[PDB]
Amino acid sequence: RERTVRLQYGSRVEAVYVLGTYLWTDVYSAAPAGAQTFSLKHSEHVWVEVVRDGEAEEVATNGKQRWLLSPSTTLRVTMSQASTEASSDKVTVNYYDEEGSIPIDQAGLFLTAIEISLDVDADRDGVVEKNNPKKASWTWGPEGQGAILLVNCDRVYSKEDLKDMSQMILRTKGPDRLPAGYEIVLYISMSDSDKVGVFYVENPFFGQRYIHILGRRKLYHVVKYTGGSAELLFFVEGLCFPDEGFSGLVSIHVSLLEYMAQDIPLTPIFTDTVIFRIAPWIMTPNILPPVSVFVCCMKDNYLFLKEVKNLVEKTNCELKVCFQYLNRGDRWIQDEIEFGYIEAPHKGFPVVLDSPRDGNLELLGPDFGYVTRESVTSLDSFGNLEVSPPVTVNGKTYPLGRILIGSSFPLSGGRRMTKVVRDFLKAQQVQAPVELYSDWLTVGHVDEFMSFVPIPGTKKFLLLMASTSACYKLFREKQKDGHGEAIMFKGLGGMSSKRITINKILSNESLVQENLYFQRCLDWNRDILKKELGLTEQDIIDLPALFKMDEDHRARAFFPNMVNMIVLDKDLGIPKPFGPQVEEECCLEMHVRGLLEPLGLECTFIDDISAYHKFLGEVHCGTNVRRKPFTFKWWHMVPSRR
Amino acid sequence: RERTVRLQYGSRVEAVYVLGTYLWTDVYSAAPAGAQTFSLKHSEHVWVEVVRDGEAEEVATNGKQRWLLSPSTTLRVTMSQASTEASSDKVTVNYYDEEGSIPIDQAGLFLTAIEISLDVDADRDGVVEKNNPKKASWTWGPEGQGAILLVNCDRVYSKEDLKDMSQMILRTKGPDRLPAGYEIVLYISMSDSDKVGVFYVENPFFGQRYIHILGRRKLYHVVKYTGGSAELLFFVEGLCFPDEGFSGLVSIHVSLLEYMAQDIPLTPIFTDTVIFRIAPWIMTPNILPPVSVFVCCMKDNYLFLKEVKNLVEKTNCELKVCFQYLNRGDRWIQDEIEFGYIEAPHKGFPVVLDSPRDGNLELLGPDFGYVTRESVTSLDSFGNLEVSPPVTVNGKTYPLGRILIGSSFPLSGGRRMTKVVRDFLKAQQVQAPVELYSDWLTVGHVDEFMSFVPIPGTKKFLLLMASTSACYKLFREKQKDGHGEAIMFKGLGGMSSKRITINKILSNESLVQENLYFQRCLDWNRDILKKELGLTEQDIIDLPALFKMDEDHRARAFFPNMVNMIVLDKDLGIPKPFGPQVEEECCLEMHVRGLLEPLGLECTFIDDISAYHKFLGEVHCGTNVRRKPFTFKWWHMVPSRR
C-alpha cells in the first residue's frame, strides 16, 4: 500500500513508517524557488528510488547523483525492518541552483518504522497466524477464509472465564516508544457495538484482570504501546446470532492515529481490519449419534419411565429424567426446548433454544449454552420444527440437512410460526429451511405426521409418514379376516364404555370422509418433502395413523401417533398405539414391526398413555435427544447468496 | 415434478393434470379387502408405467396383464399433451380375488391435462420466452438469468400508460373449461406488496382497461380461465429501489387451487413462480458522453451564461438554463439534483434524484424519471457525491465505476452523510461505494477537491486533485521572478481594498500553516483514492488551490476551486480563478493550461463570480451534465456477496 509523505519546504519531517506500506515522497515542493536540481542521501535500512515519470531507479546511501527538479520526479521510500534504539533511519535531500555544486538548502525525512498487525485465525485451524492476507474478508467453502466467533450463550473477569472466546492478537515491533504525537486505538462501529464484545488486560503490572474494552457504549480503546517485539492478547465474543437485520459479520479495526493540534481530529495514518463471522445455530437430525435422552412426564407415569429406561439401556446413551413445572406444558422438553449446537475451529458446544410457555422462572447443565426467547400459536412450538438428514437436491448439496417448519397455505389465512422465529432460522443459512403444511392439525406440529430414521448398516435414511390410508387398508383386511369385533384401547378403563372396535370405526361414514381429507393433507406434504429433500418413493415408509376432526376441520390423533418416536440409531421408541387386538397382539404394532424390522430397525413400544386411563388425542410426555454434531464443518458449506 | 394422486377405494377420482409434472398413483388402497391382483387399461394420451419396488414397466392401453397387489407396487402416470373436447383421458384399474379372472371391483382416474406457465423474460432479451427453466431464480453475470423490473419513477389505465413496465404472460392450454372445483389465482406476499404492482385487463369484452390487480392491499387475484391455447398479458412495475431492508428481488406466483369444501382452505395443487430483480439506480461518471448541460444562476449573471453557452457551442450538447427558486440553494442543479439512470433489457431512461433544500413546491422534462426524498448537514448535498470511471482494483473489476461519498474520520465525531442516503447507495450494489474525507471542508463536498477527466483519444482517465502545495510552489516561483506585487482578484471591485498580492499571501504565516494542514487532508484522500480506485501517480494531476480556515478549523476556497469543472469530453469549463496577473495573463490559468493542454484537453475559463464583485469562498452558480449510460449492462456485473 502506497502512502503520501511530502518533504516540507525548509523544515524536517518526522514520520512513522508502518511495515507493509511504502511511501511516495514529493521533493519538489520543499525545493526553494529557483532551485534546479537535487541529490539525496539515506541510511542503511531505508531503500530509496528516484521515480521519473514512472521509471524507478534505486539510489545509493551516499552518492553524488543529481536529478532535475520536476513535479513528475519523486521518491519512493521503503523499509523492510522495524526501527530499534540503534536505528537512525533517514533520507536527506539537498537542493542546488543553476550556478554552484554546493547545496543551497536541504530537506530531511526522519523515519521510525514499526510493525503493526491485528491478527486472527482466518485460516480456521484454531491458531492465530501472523497477518493472514485474507483476514479482512470472510469467504465460505473448503478453500474459504476468515475468522469465526461464537455467541456467548452463558449470560473484571479472568482468563479462564474467557476460555471459550475467540483470540485476537495485536502484534507490534519497534523501538522503546512511539514518536511524540502518536497512539494506537482499537475500535468498532456503533452498529457492531451490540454484536460483539472485546476483553483486554488494561493493567498487566497489577495482575491479569480482563476488562471489557469494546462493546455496548464502548466504541474505541486506546492501547498502550510496548517496545521491542510485543503481543497484546484480546478475547472476542459474539453477542447474538445472525437474524433478519444482521448477516453475522462484524469488523474490528486498529489505527495508528497522529495528533495534529488541539481541536483537530487525529489523523488515521495506518488502519488494519479483521472480520469475524458469528457461528450459526445448527439443529441435529435423527441420523446423528445420540448422546443423551431427555424425557419429561408426571412423577407417577411409571410404565413410561420404566419402558424408556429399558430402551435407553439398550444403547450407550444416558437418560435424563425431568418432571413437570408450573410455567411449562406437559410436553415441554419436546415443545419448549430444542437441542442444537454451534462450532468454531477451536471449539464448539451444544446450545439449547428455550421458549417457555409462561416464560422463565430449568437447565440441562453447564455443558450447554442456553438461549431464551425475549400472541403465539401452537405452531410456535419446537414440536413444529424438524430437520432432515443431509440431502442433495438437483445437484445442490445440503450437507447439514434442511430445517422443516409447519405452516398453512399462503392464501388460507391460517396459522403460521412467528416471523421472528422463521427469520431467525432463515438467517442461520446453513440449514436452508422449508415450510410444510401443518395447519390441518389441531396442534399444528410437523412432528405429528413425519419423522426420519437411519437405515442400519448404511449411510441412508427413510422418511416416515403417517398414513390414514394404510390404517383403513389394515383395518379392512382384519375385518374381512373375521376380526371386525376386535376392540381398541384395551386396558384403558376410561375408553371401555365406548366399546370401539374395527367394525365401529369402519362403519363411521363421516370419519371415513374426514380421514380421506387428512390423507390429502399428508400427500401434499409428501410431495413437498420429495421435491425439497430429493426423495423418491423408495425413501418413504407409511405408518398407519387415524385422526378425528374438530370444529375447525383440524385433525387430532384417534390413537397415539406412532411416527413421533425416539430414534436412537437402530433402536426406536415407538408410542404404543393401543390398536385392535388380534390373536392377543396389537395389529398396529405387528404391522409396524413388519415394515421396520426387515430393515434392521429394532422396535420398542412405549406406553405413555396408560397412567391417564384413556386417550383423547393429547400426549402428556415428551422426549428430546441430544446428538453429536455433524462431522462436516458448517464453514465448508457454500450457501446460495441472499 | 412428481405429484401424489391416489385411487379412491370404490369411487372414481377426477383430477387436473398439469403438464410438466407426473403422477404417482397408489392402486393398493382402493383395492377391496382380500383382492390379490390387479390389471389396468388406459386411453391413448395417457402413459402408464407399473413401478414395482423401483422397477418401472410401460403398460399398453388395453392389455390383460396382471400384477400382485402390493403397497410397493404403484403406477406412474404421465401425459405429454393438454386435453381438448375430443379427449377422454383416463386410467382404469380392475381388481381380482384369488379365485376368478373376472374383476371383483374397479377404480378409475379421469384426467384433464392443462398447460399452465407464468412466463417472463428471464433471458433478458426483451421478449418473454416460453417457460424459462431458470425463471424462478435470479443470477448475476454474463451467463446469468432472471427477469428485470424498472421502478416506476413517474408518480383504470391504458396499455400506452403501461408501455414501459415489464411484461408477464400467463400461458395456458386446455379444454373449454376447467373441471368443477378449480380456479387459477395470481398472488404475491404481504412483504412484496409495497415493492410491486401488477396490471391486468379484467374484462376484455368491455374494452382493454387495465386495472391494478396486485400490490398494496391486494395480495391475490383470481384470473378467468380461457379454453384452447390462451395468453393473459400482465404488466409489472417496481415500486421502490433496493434499500437497507430490501434486496431488490420480488416474487409472483400463480396457483391452480382445488375447492375441497366450505370452510376448508383451497388446496394449491400446482404453483409456478417467477422472480424479478428491480433495476438499481446508477450514476454516470465524467468520462461518459454528454447529452445535455444543465446550469442554474441568477438572471443577471451574464458572463457566466455567455461563457457557458460558448463552451457548449463547442460541443454537440444542448444547454438547459434554469434560474433560482425560493425553496432551493444557489447551486441546486448541482447540489439538490443528481442525474443517473436505470435500465432493463427492453428499455431504460434517465432518473433524477431530487433532494430540495426546503422541500418541493421543477422538472427537467418528461424524458426523466423523478425520485424525491421523503437534521441534515451540507454533507447530504449531491455536491458530496461523485462516481469514478470504470476501474480494476487488485483484479476485481468495477465496470460501472465506484461511487464516492465525503465523510469524516470514524472516531472524529464529525459530520457524515445521512445513513438513509448512504444505505440507499450501498444497496444499489453495482457501484460499490467508497467513503472519502470531506469534513475538513466547511461545506464538506468531495467536488470541492477532486474530479475526473478522460484523456482524449484514449480509453484512459485522470484524477484531478486540488493541491495547496502546487499553489505555494507557483506563487514562490513568481515572487522569485520579481512578480511578488502581482495582484489577485483583478476586476472584482469589492476585493480591491484588500490589495491582495503574491507577497501578501506568502508572508501570511498562519495561512501557510493552515494550508500545509489542508494538504495533509488532500493527501489522505489521495491515498484512499489510489487504493480503492487502483490508481498510481501517473493517473493523477494536481491543480493549484488555496483555502482559508474557519473557526471549526475547516477550509473554504480562497479563490474559486478550479477542480470543480464542467467536463464535456475534450472540452473543460474551468472556474476562472482570478489569480495574480503576470504579463497580463492569470498565472493560475496559464499553469493549468500547461498541465492539461498537452494531453489534448481544451480549457475554457468560466467566470461565475464577477457579477457579485468579490469572492468570499461561496459560488452562486451550479451545473450538472446529463450523460449517456454505460454500454456495459449492469446485470452482467458480478458483485461481491453481502
Ligand SMILES: [Ca+2]
Ligand atoms: Ca490459524
Ligand SMILES: [Ca+2]
Ligand atoms: Ca423439534
Ligand SMILES: [Ca+2]
Ligand atoms: Ca426473453
Ligand SMILES: [Ca+2]
Ligand atoms: Ca454530484
